[PDB]
Protein backbone atom coordinates (compact mmCIF):
# COMPACT_ATOMS: atom_id res chain seq x y z
CA UNK A 1 0.00 0.00 0.00
CA UNK A 2 0.73 3.73 0.02
CA UNK A 3 2.79 3.68 3.22
CA UNK A 4 4.96 0.57 2.59
CA UNK A 5 5.78 1.70 -0.96
CA UNK A 6 7.38 4.88 0.52
CA UNK A 7 9.40 3.09 3.23
CA UNK A 8 13.03 2.02 2.78
CA UNK A 9 14.29 -0.78 5.06
CA UNK A 10 17.75 0.09 6.40
CA UNK A 11 18.62 -2.74 8.79
CA UNK A 12 17.16 -5.95 10.25
CA UNK A 13 17.40 -5.41 14.03
CA UNK A 14 15.64 -8.46 15.47
CA UNK A 15 14.29 -11.90 14.49
CA UNK A 16 11.75 -13.23 17.02
CA UNK A 17 9.04 -15.91 17.44
CA UNK A 18 6.63 -14.09 15.08
CA UNK A 19 7.91 -11.48 12.66
CA UNK A 20 11.24 -9.80 12.02
CA UNK A 21 11.87 -6.18 13.13
CA UNK A 22 13.60 -3.66 10.84
CA UNK A 23 14.71 -0.04 11.15
CA UNK A 24 13.22 1.82 8.15
CA UNK A 25 12.90 5.39 6.82
CA UNK A 26 9.46 6.89 6.13
CA UNK A 27 9.10 10.50 4.89
CA UNK A 28 12.70 11.08 6.11
CA UNK A 29 12.04 9.76 9.64
CA UNK A 30 13.19 6.54 11.28
CA UNK A 31 10.38 4.00 11.92
CA UNK A 32 10.25 0.40 13.06
CA UNK A 33 8.78 -2.16 10.72
CA UNK A 34 7.76 -5.62 11.92
CA UNK A 35 7.51 -7.97 8.94
CA UNK A 36 5.57 -11.24 8.79
CA UNK A 37 5.40 -13.81 6.02
CA UNK A 38 2.15 -14.89 4.26
CA UNK A 39 1.90 -17.96 6.54
CA UNK A 40 1.96 -15.68 9.70
CA UNK A 41 -1.15 -13.67 8.68
CA UNK A 42 -3.07 -14.63 11.88
CA UNK A 43 -0.31 -13.22 14.12
CA UNK A 44 0.06 -10.10 11.97
CA UNK A 45 -3.71 -9.43 11.91
CA UNK A 46 -4.13 -9.96 15.66
CA UNK A 47 -1.26 -7.54 16.45
CA UNK A 48 -2.74 -4.94 14.00
CA UNK A 49 -6.12 -5.44 15.77
CA UNK A 50 -4.68 -4.79 19.23
CA UNK A 51 -2.67 -1.76 18.14
CA UNK A 52 -5.80 -0.25 16.53
CA UNK A 53 -7.83 -0.48 19.77
CA UNK A 54 -9.86 2.72 20.33
CA UNK A 55 -8.12 5.21 22.69
CA UNK A 56 -5.02 3.01 23.02
CA UNK A 57 -2.47 5.78 22.35
CA UNK A 58 -0.45 6.89 25.37
CA UNK A 59 3.06 8.24 25.92
CA UNK A 60 4.03 4.93 27.61
CA UNK A 61 2.56 2.61 24.92
CA UNK A 62 4.45 2.10 21.64
CA UNK A 63 2.99 4.48 19.00
CA UNK A 64 1.47 2.51 16.12
CA UNK A 65 1.47 4.02 12.61
CA UNK A 66 -0.11 1.43 10.25
CA UNK A 67 -0.56 -2.04 8.97
CA UNK A 68 0.36 -2.59 5.30
CA UNK A 69 1.47 -5.22 2.75
CA UNK A 70 4.41 -5.12 0.30
CA UNK A 71 4.82 -7.31 -2.77
CA UNK A 72 8.42 -7.42 -3.99
CA UNK A 73 7.39 -9.23 -7.21
CA UNK A 74 8.08 -12.74 -5.75
CA UNK A 75 6.37 -12.80 -2.33
CA UNK A 76 4.17 -10.63 -0.13
CA UNK A 77 5.37 -9.22 3.22
CA UNK A 78 2.82 -8.25 5.90
CA UNK A 79 3.96 -5.07 7.72
CA UNK A 80 3.31 -3.33 11.04
CA UNK A 81 4.89 0.15 11.14
CA UNK A 82 5.50 1.89 14.48
CA UNK A 83 7.62 4.52 16.16
CA UNK A 84 11.35 3.86 16.36
CA UNK A 85 13.22 4.12 19.66
CA UNK A 86 17.04 4.17 19.21
CA UNK A 87 17.81 2.85 22.72
CA UNK A 88 15.88 -0.32 21.90
CA UNK A 89 14.58 -2.48 24.72
CA UNK A 90 14.79 -1.86 28.46
CA UNK A 91 16.76 -5.18 28.55
CA UNK A 92 19.37 -3.71 26.15
CA UNK A 93 19.38 -0.37 28.04
CA UNK A 94 19.95 -2.03 31.44
CA UNK A 95 22.73 -4.22 30.06
CA UNK A 96 24.54 -1.18 28.55
CA UNK A 97 24.00 1.36 31.36
CA UNK A 98 23.63 1.92 35.07
CA UNK A 99 20.98 4.43 36.09
CA UNK A 100 20.73 7.22 38.67
CA UNK A 101 17.95 7.22 41.35
CA UNK A 102 16.15 9.73 39.02
CA UNK A 103 16.74 7.38 36.05
CA UNK A 104 15.33 4.36 37.90
CA UNK A 105 12.18 6.21 39.03
CA UNK A 106 11.60 7.54 35.46
CA UNK A 107 11.82 4.00 33.97
CA UNK A 108 9.60 2.40 36.65
CA UNK A 109 6.91 5.12 36.79
CA UNK A 110 6.64 5.24 32.98
CA UNK A 111 6.28 1.40 32.80
CA UNK A 112 3.59 1.47 35.49
CA UNK A 113 1.82 4.38 33.73
CA UNK A 114 1.76 2.47 30.44
CA UNK A 115 0.47 -0.69 32.19
CA UNK A 116 -2.16 1.29 34.11
CA UNK A 117 -3.42 2.72 30.78
CA UNK A 118 -3.52 -0.76 29.12
CA UNK A 119 -5.40 -2.19 32.13
CA UNK A 120 -7.85 0.73 32.28
CA UNK A 121 -11.38 0.45 30.93
CA UNK A 122 -12.74 3.80 29.62
CA UNK A 123 -16.53 3.67 29.40
CA UNK A 124 -18.23 5.63 26.56
CA UNK A 125 -18.91 6.07 22.79
CA UNK A 126 -15.12 6.11 22.03
CA UNK A 127 -14.48 3.76 24.95
CA UNK A 128 -11.38 1.74 25.53
CA UNK A 129 -11.60 -1.89 26.69
CA UNK A 130 -9.27 -3.05 29.44
CA UNK A 131 -6.30 -4.96 27.98
CA UNK A 132 -3.92 -7.47 29.59
CA UNK A 133 -0.50 -7.90 28.01
CA UNK A 134 0.29 -11.55 28.88
CA UNK A 135 3.98 -11.23 27.95
CA UNK A 136 5.39 -8.29 29.92
CA UNK A 137 9.24 -8.46 30.27
CA UNK A 138 12.21 -6.12 29.90
CA UNK A 139 12.75 -7.28 26.28
CA UNK A 140 9.14 -6.07 25.50
CA UNK A 141 9.55 -2.55 26.87
CA UNK A 142 11.33 0.17 24.86
CA UNK A 143 13.25 3.16 26.18
CA UNK A 144 12.62 6.59 24.61
CA UNK A 145 15.16 9.38 24.10
CA UNK A 146 13.79 11.16 27.21
CA UNK A 147 14.59 8.20 29.52
CA UNK A 148 10.96 7.02 29.87
CA UNK A 149 9.60 3.64 28.73
CA UNK A 150 6.89 2.50 26.42
CA UNK A 151 5.28 -0.92 26.49
CA UNK A 152 5.57 -2.79 23.20
CA UNK A 153 5.00 -6.31 21.76
CA UNK A 154 1.24 -6.23 22.35
CA UNK A 155 0.51 -9.13 19.96
CA UNK A 156 -0.37 -11.62 22.74
CA UNK A 157 -2.74 -9.25 24.53
CA UNK A 158 -6.32 -10.02 25.54
CA UNK A 159 -9.21 -7.53 25.71
CA UNK A 160 -12.14 -7.48 28.15
CA UNK A 161 -15.86 -7.05 27.44
CA UNK A 162 -16.93 -5.60 30.83
CA UNK A 163 -20.71 -5.86 30.28
CA UNK A 164 -20.51 -9.71 30.04
CA UNK A 165 -17.15 -10.21 31.87
CA UNK A 166 -15.70 -12.16 28.88
CA UNK A 167 -12.41 -12.05 26.96
CA UNK A 168 -12.28 -11.31 23.22
CA UNK A 169 -10.20 -14.31 22.18
CA UNK A 170 -11.37 -16.62 25.06
CA UNK A 171 -7.84 -17.89 25.98
CA UNK A 172 -7.57 -21.59 26.87
CA UNK A 173 -3.78 -22.03 26.87
CA UNK A 174 -0.68 -20.58 28.52
CA UNK A 175 1.29 -18.09 26.44
CA UNK A 176 4.21 -15.82 27.19
CA UNK A 177 7.77 -15.97 28.33
CA UNK A 178 8.27 -18.73 30.87
CA UNK A 179 10.71 -16.87 33.14
CA UNK A 180 8.07 -14.11 33.76
CA UNK A 181 5.04 -16.36 34.18
CA UNK A 182 3.05 -15.75 37.32
CA UNK A 183 2.80 -18.59 39.90
CA UNK A 184 -0.85 -19.24 38.95
CA UNK A 185 0.09 -19.44 35.23
CA UNK A 186 2.96 -21.84 35.95
CA UNK A 187 0.80 -24.23 38.05
CA UNK A 188 -2.25 -23.72 35.74
CA UNK A 189 -4.51 -22.71 38.68
CA UNK A 190 -5.37 -19.40 36.93
CA UNK A 191 -9.00 -19.04 35.84
CA UNK A 192 -8.59 -18.08 32.14
CA UNK A 193 -12.27 -16.96 32.03
CA UNK A 194 -11.49 -14.27 34.67
CA UNK A 195 -9.97 -11.16 33.02
CA UNK A 196 -8.85 -9.67 36.39
CA UNK A 197 -6.56 -12.77 36.76
CA UNK A 198 -4.64 -11.72 33.61
CA UNK A 199 -4.17 -8.18 34.96
CA UNK A 200 -2.79 -9.62 38.23
CA UNK A 201 -0.35 -11.90 36.28
CA UNK A 202 0.96 -8.79 34.41
CA UNK A 203 1.66 -7.11 37.79
CA UNK A 204 3.79 -10.06 38.92
CA UNK A 205 5.85 -9.71 35.70
CA UNK A 206 6.14 -5.91 36.18
CA UNK A 207 7.53 -6.59 39.70
CA UNK A 208 10.25 -8.74 38.09
CA UNK A 209 11.08 -5.90 35.61
CA UNK A 210 11.30 -3.43 38.58
CA UNK A 211 13.87 -5.74 40.18
CA UNK A 212 15.95 -5.68 36.94
CA UNK A 213 15.90 -1.83 36.97
CA UNK A 214 16.74 -1.47 40.70
CA UNK A 215 19.85 -3.68 40.37
CA UNK A 216 21.23 -1.12 37.88
CA UNK A 217 20.58 1.90 40.11
CA UNK A 218 24.04 3.23 41.01
CA UNK A 219 24.28 5.15 44.36
CA UNK A 220 27.75 6.23 45.46
CA UNK A 221 29.09 3.95 42.71
CA UNK A 222 27.39 0.85 44.18
CA UNK A 223 25.22 -1.28 41.86
CA UNK A 224 24.67 -4.90 40.83
CA UNK A 225 25.54 -6.41 37.40
CA UNK A 226 22.67 -6.87 34.95
CA UNK A 227 20.73 -10.13 35.44
CA UNK A 228 17.41 -11.60 34.37
CA UNK A 229 15.08 -12.50 37.25
CA UNK A 230 15.85 -16.04 38.52
CA UNK A 231 19.36 -16.04 36.91
CA UNK A 232 20.56 -17.70 40.17
CA UNK A 233 17.96 -20.52 40.08
CA UNK A 234 17.09 -21.56 36.52
CA UNK A 235 18.94 -22.08 33.20
CA UNK A 236 18.72 -19.78 30.16
CA UNK A 237 15.44 -20.46 28.24
CA UNK A 238 13.87 -22.24 31.29
CA UNK A 239 10.98 -24.68 30.96
CA UNK A 240 7.57 -24.34 32.69
CA UNK A 241 8.57 -27.24 35.01
CA UNK A 242 11.92 -25.55 35.94
CA UNK A 243 10.14 -22.28 36.75
CA UNK A 244 7.28 -24.00 38.59
CA UNK A 245 9.65 -25.90 40.89
CA UNK A 246 11.30 -22.57 41.92
CA UNK A 247 8.36 -20.12 41.99
CA UNK A 248 5.50 -22.42 43.10
CA UNK A 249 7.06 -25.31 45.04
CA UNK A 250 10.15 -23.75 46.72
CA UNK A 251 8.30 -20.35 46.73
CA UNK A 252 11.38 -18.32 45.85
CA UNK A 253 11.52 -14.86 44.32
CA UNK A 254 14.47 -12.70 43.13
CA UNK A 255 16.72 -11.60 46.02
CA UNK A 256 16.12 -8.14 47.50
CA UNK A 257 19.50 -6.86 48.86
CA UNK A 258 19.21 -5.52 52.46
CA UNK A 259 21.17 -2.41 51.26
CA UNK A 260 18.10 -1.35 49.20
CA UNK A 261 16.66 -0.31 52.67
CA UNK A 262 19.56 2.25 52.98
CA UNK A 263 18.06 4.41 50.17
CA UNK A 264 14.45 5.76 50.27
CA UNK A 265 13.81 5.30 46.48
CA UNK A 266 15.22 1.72 46.62
CA UNK A 267 13.13 1.01 49.76
CA UNK A 268 9.90 2.13 47.97
CA UNK A 269 10.92 0.01 44.90
CA UNK A 270 11.66 -3.12 47.04
CA UNK A 271 8.31 -2.80 48.83
CA UNK A 272 6.48 -2.55 45.44
CA UNK A 273 8.36 -5.69 44.23
CA UNK A 274 7.29 -7.72 47.26
CA UNK A 275 3.67 -6.53 46.81
CA UNK A 276 3.75 -7.65 43.12
CA UNK A 277 5.20 -11.07 44.06
CA UNK A 278 2.53 -12.47 46.32
CA UNK A 279 1.47 -15.96 45.26
CA UNK A 280 -2.18 -14.84 45.58
CA UNK A 281 -2.91 -12.56 42.60
CA UNK A 282 -5.76 -10.85 44.53
CA UNK A 283 -3.26 -9.47 47.11
CA UNK A 284 -1.04 -7.79 44.49
CA UNK A 285 -0.89 -4.00 43.97
CA UNK A 286 -2.73 -2.60 40.92
CA UNK A 287 -0.81 -0.74 38.21
CA UNK A 288 -2.75 2.45 39.11
CA UNK A 289 -1.66 2.12 42.76
CA UNK A 290 2.01 1.63 41.73
CA UNK A 291 1.75 4.68 39.40
CA UNK A 292 0.43 6.76 42.37
CA UNK A 293 3.27 5.62 44.70
CA UNK A 294 5.99 6.27 42.16
CA UNK A 295 4.45 9.62 41.14
CA UNK A 296 4.68 10.67 44.85
CA UNK A 297 8.35 9.51 44.83
CA UNK A 298 9.19 11.38 41.53
CA UNK A 299 7.68 14.61 43.01
CA UNK A 300 9.86 14.16 46.15
CA UNK A 301 13.04 13.71 44.05
CA UNK A 302 12.32 16.73 41.79
CA UNK A 303 12.52 14.84 38.47
Ligand SMILES: Nc1ccc(Nc2ncnc3c2C(=O)CC=N3)cc1
Nearest residue numbers: 013014021032082083084085088089
Ligand atom coordinates in the same frame (compact mmCIF):
# COMPACT_ATOMS: atom_id res chain seq x y z
N1 LIG B 1 17.80 -5.63 20.40
C1 LIG B 1 16.58 -5.09 19.95
C2 LIG B 1 15.87 -4.20 20.75
C3 LIG B 1 14.68 -3.67 20.30
C4 LIG B 1 14.17 -4.02 19.06
N2 LIG B 1 12.95 -3.49 18.61
C5 LIG B 1 12.70 -2.14 18.48
N3 LIG B 1 13.68 -1.25 18.59
C6 LIG B 1 13.44 0.03 18.48
N4 LIG B 1 12.25 0.53 18.22
C7 LIG B 1 11.21 -0.27 18.09
C8 LIG B 1 11.41 -1.66 18.21
C9 LIG B 1 10.25 -2.55 18.06
O1 LIG B 1 10.35 -3.74 18.17
C10 LIG B 1 9.01 -1.95 17.75
C11 LIG B 1 8.91 -0.62 17.64
N5 LIG B 1 9.96 0.21 17.82
C12 LIG B 1 14.88 -4.91 18.27
C13 LIG B 1 16.08 -5.44 18.71
